[PDB]
């Protein structure tokens, strides 16, 4: 479960 970065 990846946490979101600015691009998401």
């Amino acid at each position, epitope marked *: 479960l*990846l*946490e*979101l*970065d*600015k*691009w*998401a």
Partner: antibody
Amino acid sequence: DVQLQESGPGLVKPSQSLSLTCTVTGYLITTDYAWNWIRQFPGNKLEWMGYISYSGFTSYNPSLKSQISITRDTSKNQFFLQLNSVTTEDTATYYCAFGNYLPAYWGQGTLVTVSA
Amino acid sequence: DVVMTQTPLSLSVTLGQPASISCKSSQSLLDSDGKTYLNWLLQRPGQSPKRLIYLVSKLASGVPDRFTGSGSGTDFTLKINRVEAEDLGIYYCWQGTHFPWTFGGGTKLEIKR
């Protein structure tokens, strides 16, 4: 688990088009995340090429814009890389990867030699 | 495009000693959202690259606390507290703050014997 598997021709002639497939297992590419392509030249240099998101939007490295296209087939859970009119400088190891959106998990990589 | 530079090119460390790698960017990696998207990558011989560090200091799932990332702005550091043999290979820093995303040229960790 989530595994990415690259596949495609290991040898392409200059001026021809390069075509690679990344087969995703253990997760639907339509669910979430960005699905990336990255290559490593001889000498270890890494270069981000672009991605196609789960929603189908694409983003490309400006250096490659007029050469590159990333597409997908949601029925086979695959996404694709295409470079038209390659040159010998496109010789590299090509990796598929995914992140949210920054790449976090990498495939096994596949070598593509561009030569006559 | 944002240039990532690493030093040294090769680092020879005795087993058990700490190792530190340096990474520098041609411009600040602090984003307007407050976060700094600086990442570390490890490539062991014959293998694909693996994620080691994201957001400067956050460890990817599976990475030992032996690995410590730090820094800000345009200066970053990767520290390996108690170097083990399997740690050998090539370490890359790369940025995701600016578009396009770009990688450092890498630093080879070799075990001194």
